[PDB]
């Protein structure tokens with residue numbers, strides 16, 4: 067007998083690809099997808115609780131594969147700037163000044179609350195005070211990869227990388243048996259981490275079976291600079307140092323030559339596409355369809371709210387689906403089904419969670435999002451997945467579960483106090499603004 | 501002489517002068533016009549019949565959707581994954597020939613207008629069939645519109661040929677002679693569907709009536725090259741030679757722009773109507789917006805139709821435009837948030853020839869206004885409300901909409917439409933078309 071039976075108009079399981087189930091039901095038990103079946107059959111099975119969801123599309127929860135969640139408190143603080151001046155003259159100085167453990171707890175919770183409301187059940191974070199990030203994640207009920215920030219210089223909470231790594235080990239330790247949080251390593255970028263630190267990270271990840279997330283090939287200037295100073299592209303450097311592989315998550319990759327493509331194919335590394343951030347900083351255009359056609363796993367992320375500036379993964383996914391057609395020069399590139407897969411299954415693959423989350427298969431965790439497609443602007447619906455990708459906003463998100471626990475009920479966050487978070491964000495904004 | 505309505509938002513963005521935002525000011529409306537913008541104390545001391553507090557909201561000129569095919573809302577998501585010519589010839593044109601009746605147009609247009617008002621659009625341009633029926637729906641909705649008479653080389657719904665389309669348009673131009681909200685324009689579809697004769701016809705008609713022309717131009721590489729190979733001139737050169745270009749010409753799309761094109765737009769003071777999401781989705785290309793803007797071309801923005809977008813979200817289109825423009829031009833300072841808002845308001849006004857009536861919050865202009873709510877969680881903290889509007893707000897933040905001081909949207913609710921009935925009607929159309 068199920069704990070919960072959901073009866074939506076449409077289910078999109080993502081696996082197998084391209085299909086939509088009409089008048090079916092999904093049964094949840096013990097925090098897992100126990101059955102997907104026609105309604106008659108599923109109803110005959112019975113459940114503690116039943117929820118009809120007419121006009122709704124039920125999908126795997128969205129996976130935001132790259133972000134810096136507490137930068138939510140810097141939303142819109144630094145517009146109109148290309149990458150290097152954005153970092154050096156605005157963001158880094160503001161991080162040195164403001165970012166404490168209290169900043170991180172408030173900013174992360176604000177970010178989570180925003181993400182759950184837009185259907186995101188799993189997220190990747192690359193930001194300071196990971197220990198604090200995990201406490202907030204733990205309380206929220208959502209799933210996360212938390213990457214340990216490794217940089218060649220002092221950062222908030224870590225005078226240097228050895229301290230960041232040592233704090234990282236303590237964290238790996240504690241969370242060994244957490245159902246929802248995975249620790250990973252977060253070397254920032256090629257130009258802010260040495261060969262030595264990169265090797266220590268590799269060995270640690272061999273030893274711990276952990277992931278690596280890094281900004282790679284964000285800008286032409288990063289690549290040309292690396293070519294002129296070291297005579298090798300930053301990706302070949304990473305390949306030479308042995309970091310590439312199925313647990314390596316290369317974020318951005320707007321600069322991809324044919325050697326780059328060959329390396330990603332060979333090693334089976336994931337690329338995390340951040341289209342809006344790459345547009346906003348004038349970083350370039352990640353060649354998504356090309357990567358996809360070559361078999362590279364391509365997930366999607368929002369990046370931070372100072373270079374987006376929302377945490378809307380559904381919106382990011384639409385932007386990616388539109389952009390990819392014109393970048394590639396074919397209207398058939400990254401169709402709605404594949405765009406949804408990028409937002410779900412490919413994120414789970416990128417984070418090493420494909421066996422737990424990312425599709426609606428029996429036995430997987432019940433990380434689910436229900437989207438409402440009954441609104442005036444979504445009519446008429448010829449294809450619900452098309453309507454999701456190209457004509458629905460994140461405000462259509464009604465319900466969200468993680469591991470079968472409901473975190474959003476008819477648009478209301480069950481584990482957060484929006485009114486308190488807003489008052490808190492506001493307090494932060496006035497102190498940072500003054 | 502108190503205002504009819506006094507609006508008290510946290511922020512006002514007047515658009516003119518550019519780049520400014522007023523805090524704790526107020527906008528008084530009288531006789532359908534902006535009577536005054538003033539600090540809140542002064543405004544309140546003046547007096548008003550009705551007063552609306554708008555804490556946490558940003559008041560702006562209403563958004564101007566400068567290109568659409570409004571009744572194609574009933575084809576929303578019907579023809580995905582197709583480039584332009586096969587989208588048109590193998591899908592959309594057949595579906596239009598099969599379904600577009602006066603009834604289709606009434607239902608589809610109202611559906612589109614209701615979607616748009618909810619998204620903060622007070623003025624829109626239509627280029628679609630049965631313009632007469634369109635005007636009836638616009639008239640009832642209270643919204644402002646340019647309605648473009650479709651001119652094509654073949655039979656269209658409601659016009660067996662060009663001659664007949666223009667017949668109806670004259671009558672329309674006449675009937676709507678004194679209309680406060682509705683302007684009639686001509687809508688030659690595209691260079692490859694409109695002959696030179698028909699083009700010369702429109703020029704003289706528009707000279708005589710002092711009316712506008714809107715036309716899809718230089719949408720794709722293939723159109724520019726086929727024209728070059730068949731006729732030895734670029735469509736925009738052909739239009740220049742024919743004498744159509746000028747301050748009342750609205751060139752839609754323009755993803756293909758060389759220096760000669762650029763000179764002709766600059767010389768003639770023609771407008772470009774940028775449709776970023778449609779250009780991306782049909783794999784048409786990238787309009788060089790910042791280049792146009794730096795050359796001093798007026799660039800406005802449109803959603804296009806719901807079968808190549810597929811929403812009618814102008815604010816979302818404006819966000820797309822503002823992001824894309826940076827990366828297309830290769831500088832993070834291109835199309836900043838204030839200018840993107842300008843593109844969605846005042847430039848759309850200039851494009852439609854309505855800049856003296858709308859597009860900015862200056863005294864004496866029409867009170868076409870939109871209130872965006874920036875007090876939501878995902879919009880905190882607000883450092884700069886216009887940045888937040890463009891880069892971090894959805895169209896569901898739109899709370900209130902007025903056109904000519906008449907409220908069309910009140911706290912998210914439409915005062916002139918029945919959403920429940922429109923939905924039911926959209927669904928019937930949906931069932932028939934899919935069956």
Ligand SMILES: CSC[C@H]1O[C@@H](n2cnc3c2N=CNC[C@H]3O)[C@H](O)[C@@H]1O
Nearest residue numbers: 134157192193215252253254281369370
């Ligand atoms: C890798 S630790 C997180 C660090 O990365 C910085 N960051 C935030 N957003 C981006 C960042 N870095 C590089 N690329 C641009 C963008 O993805 C952030 O400010 C912080 O300093």
Ligand SMILES: CSC[C@H]1O[C@@H](n2cnc3c2N=CNC[C@H]3O)[C@H](O)[C@@H]1O
Nearest residue numbers: 569592627628650651687689716804805
């Ligand atoms: C002048 S009538 C408007 C006509 O243009 C067609 N159209 C709709 N959306 C677009 C159209 N035409 C050309 N370019 C692609 C896009 O803007 C529409 O289906 C209708 O046939």
Ligand SMILES: [Zn+2]
Nearest residue numbers: 134281369370
């Ligand atoms: Zn990042």
Ligand SMILES: [Zn+2]
Nearest residue numbers: 342374376378
């Ligand atoms: Zn975004």
Ligand SMILES: [Zn+2]
Nearest residue numbers: 567716804805
């Ligand atoms: Zn069009």
Ligand SMILES: [Zn+2]
Nearest residue numbers: 777809811813
């Ligand atoms: Zn859109």
